[PDB]
From a paper:
Neurotransmitter transporters of the solute carrier 6 (SLC6) family enforce spatiotemporal control of neurotransmitter levels in the synaptic space through Na+/Cl−-coupled uptake in the central and peripheral nervous systems. Here, we employ the [name] dopamine transporter as a surrogate for the norepinephrine transporter and determine X-ray structures of the transporter in its substrate-free and norepinephrine-bound forms. In this study, we employ dDAT as a surrogate of hNET to study the interaction of NE within the primary binding site. The dDAT primary binding site is identical to hNET in subsites A and C, whereas it differs by two residues in subsite B with polar substitutions; Asp, instead of Gly, at position 121 (149 in hNET) and Ser, instead of a Met, at position 426 (424 in hNET).
The dDATsubB construct, with hNET-like mutations, was crystallized in the substrate-free Na+ and Cl−-bound conformation to observe for structural changes in the binding pocket. Incidentally, the position of PEG coincides with the position of the detergent binding secondary site in LeuT and also with S-citalopram bound allosteric site in hSERT. Within the primary binding site, clear density was observed for most of the residues lining the binding pocket. Solvent accessibility into the primary binding site is unhindered by the F319, which remains splayed open thereby retaining dDAT in an outward-open conformation. Interestingly, the sidechain of F325 located in the TM6 linker is positioned in a manner that resembles the antidepressant-bound conformation resulting in a primary binding site with substantial solvent accessibility. The demonstration of an outward-open conformation in the crystal structure of the substrate-free form of dDAT is a corroboration of these biophysical and computational observations.
Numbering used by the authors:
A (entry chain H): 1 to 219
B (entry chain L): 1 to 214
C (entry chain A): 25 to 161, 203 to 599
Write the structure that this text describes.
Amino acid sequence: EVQLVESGGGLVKPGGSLKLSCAASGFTFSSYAMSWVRQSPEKRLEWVAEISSGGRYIYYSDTVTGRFTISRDNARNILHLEMSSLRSEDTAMYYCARGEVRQRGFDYWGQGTTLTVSSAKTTAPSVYPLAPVCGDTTGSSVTLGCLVKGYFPEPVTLTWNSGSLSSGVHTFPAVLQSDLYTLSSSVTVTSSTWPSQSITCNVAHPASSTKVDKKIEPR
Amino acid sequence: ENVLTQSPAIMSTSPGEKVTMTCRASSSVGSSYLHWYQQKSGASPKLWIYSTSNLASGVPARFSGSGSGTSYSLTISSVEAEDAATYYCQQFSGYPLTFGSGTKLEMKRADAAPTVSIFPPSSEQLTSGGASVVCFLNNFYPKDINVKWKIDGSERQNGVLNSWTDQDSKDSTYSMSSTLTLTKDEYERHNSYTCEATHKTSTSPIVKSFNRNE
Amino acid sequence: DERETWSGKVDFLLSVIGFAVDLANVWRFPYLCYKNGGGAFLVPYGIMLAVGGIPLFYMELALGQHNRKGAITCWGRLVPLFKGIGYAVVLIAFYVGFYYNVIIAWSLRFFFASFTNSLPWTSCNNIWNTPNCRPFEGHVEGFQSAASEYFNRYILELNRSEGIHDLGAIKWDMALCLLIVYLICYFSLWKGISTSGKVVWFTALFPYAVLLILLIRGLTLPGSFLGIQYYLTPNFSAIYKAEVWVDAATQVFFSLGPGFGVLLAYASYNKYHNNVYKDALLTSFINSATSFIAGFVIFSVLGYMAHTLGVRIEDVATEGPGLVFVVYPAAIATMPASTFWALIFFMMLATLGLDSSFGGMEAIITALSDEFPKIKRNRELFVAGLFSLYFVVGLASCTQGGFYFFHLLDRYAAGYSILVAVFFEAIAVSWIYGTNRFSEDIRDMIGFPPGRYWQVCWRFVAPIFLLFITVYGLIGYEPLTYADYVYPSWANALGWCIAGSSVVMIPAVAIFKLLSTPGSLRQRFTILTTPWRD
Ligand SMILES: CC(C)CCC[C@@H](C)[C@H]1CC[C@H]2[C@@H]3CC=C4C[C@@H](O)CC[C@]4(C)[C@H]3CC[C@]12C
Ligand SMILES: CC(C)CCC[C@@H](C)[C@H]1CC[C@H]2[C@@H]3CC=C4C[C@@H](O)CC[C@]4(C)[C@H]3CC[C@]12C
Ligand SMILES: [Cl-]
Ligand code: NA
Ligand code: NA
């Protein structure tokens, strides 16, 4: 029944400052040493800080020491991590990991909250529908895509027909190029289901409140 | 700082193999302070093995830990398909705490060819500054593949975005999306548009091209 | 920072193992098994070990390694309201040195009084004997043995003393022995750990060499099994009693010497991140194990006496110096190759007391070497004054009536003082310092927190375990006597001053500092329960 839940987390400019917090329930939080472990978008686990069961011994990472400040209060069952002088390489998903006994490691891990340090400007995507060329229109199934170009930051939500069909779909991960992401997806469905049907692309950018839909015009 | 180096980075195995991954160290580590973590896709890690050899609750007994000193290892007796994950080693000997380079377990399956399908620019984008061509190389194995963009038999090289998918959960395959992007003034001059995909499966590359007017 | 450490972690273990293994392991534990139901006595001895003694032993040396400072500085740097604890602990350790080192001197006298082909404590046709002598022991009062008279009428010269006042001349052979004691104390404790941690290799290990030799010798004797039968035959009806648990709990305390400032002092030289928990468990086991082995060494010979010499064992199964200076030396005079066992037995008794004494006197130096920086600067020329102070007064313990002076301090000087001293150490940690505050200290070094068992023991069991003793100790108090000598009314009084002179300094600082710090009352009580690091 033990649970860790992180919070805070978001876009920050270099040199910026932000405070992440972790709520703990399911155990007596006042008796387990907690640690912040971040993992980069390249999936590299990197330890940040450890705080004692009563916050009396605190160890920092050589790459956050002075800039980062770990803290806890046990009446509230919250564990905090304030960041300052934020550099770009501090971008990661920040995990709140319970690890009292050194010889047993981190028992439970929270779900993690994401932080981005970029000077890049928040832009909304340009959503384009991918209609196949008019040649060789014969195959058993036909496939068609949706290009979500030029947005920042992550994430973006793509579904086909409001999330109805999901078979034979391939939504690709985003790729950043000169401070801009670009994402594509493909849906393959029987030629006996298109272009005689409503197939649409649903794009959702929360950071810019951009909710855009688009059907594929076979013209 | 004592750095742990895991190997291999990617481990391709089918269910039933005996697999063993290592975790070498820059400095010696106490046999009680070395731990292993399994991290599935889109999820937070989980304590898999603590103090070299002792596995946590829920961890099936097909898992085992061994090694000591500066060289440890993780071993699965018989791989199951649910074991497809990334495995991290971590040390508590001294601060700062370091994790391992991670070993990603990926499932093996029979080779496959890309069902390639080219797409012209969209009429909507055809009103912005330029135009982009999106090629799709879906449902194929293994993961590595080489695209070639051509406009008039001429290899266009710059201005391409490539993105692979992670291994699919049901058919253990991959997929890729190459996206050549030009301006209109560069687009509306040449006609042919060649997405030529070279893969290990075929001798000659699978080609999907199209003429701009049809 | 920059405080020297043990040259090798063994140097530490042998130093603490030698400290807790004294003559109580030899002359009090096996008698207690005999007195209190044989093997059945082990249960309350084993309980009181696990719930009382061990958790207290674990404590004092966990504090040493952590706070890295000597007893007084240590206690001042985590609860200043009770800094007076650290002083009393060293005062008790101070007084002990005046009388404990005599037992070493006595064994030393017996040592090079055994360099002859026929030991003198066998006959009764000598200049110092009495028409009331008997060849061996007996259940009669005024008809002592052949060795009970050599001890009194020759070695101690005690019969020429009418009490504590009459002290007669100074037995100068004894004074030289006591000189030899403190002298090898000095040449083993002046250059620091770099030699103390080395000397203990002889003093802690030599007894086990000797213990094995006499363990082999004793079991190979007519009637040896009979003594083991008297040693371990169970009478569980003793467990249903109450004095047994007091006898057991008491021995566990003093056979382990927790909170005396010595484990704190010894452990204050460990590296920070050392598995103290493995240390305390190992050393304390070796202690109780040695008592068990020693008990076989004693009663193997004891049974040999009831089978080949015709003595009621209840007249030889005794405790204290009567066992190791009269009863056991009388039996090895009979068995062949006598002069060998005698010489090795007494040096064992010497190496049993020396390493135990080192820890007490090292606890004194280390206490104030951390508090008084003038001390650590020139330490070699500090202890030479302290030991000459120990020696000069120790000439009283070398006079004709010197034993009467020894027996007083054994019953008073540290008998109750260190009992209520430790009792405040336990409360100053489990409630003022706090288990929560203390657990993560241990987690920081050894990597994991003390389990819930050690917490409940430190919080509820150990304090009542101490009052369990101190309650019974006082009701069992009678005016001090020895044989047909009743110490005068003032003799009892002076001892209570000796004992009180330590405990009185606990509130005498709880009030000195309470009025020497500014602010409100609640502000003063809160400003005086805040440690040093914070
Ligand atoms: C049957 C009886 C008489 C035999 C006694 C066995 C003696 C020799 C045993 C019992 C306790 C043992 C010691 C206990 C403590 C340690 C610390 C360890 O890190 C090194 C070995 C060392 C130093 C042991 C040396 C041998 C030892 C002293
Ligand atoms: C013959 C002599 C040596 C018998 C030895 C008695 C002692 C050393 C034995 C008997 C009971 C044992 C204890 C039983 C219970 C526990 C609680 C556990 O959480 C730590 C170990 C500990 C504390 C054991 C330590 C060793 C122990 C105290
Ligand atoms: Cl004992
Ligand atoms: Na003892
Ligand atoms: Na000893």
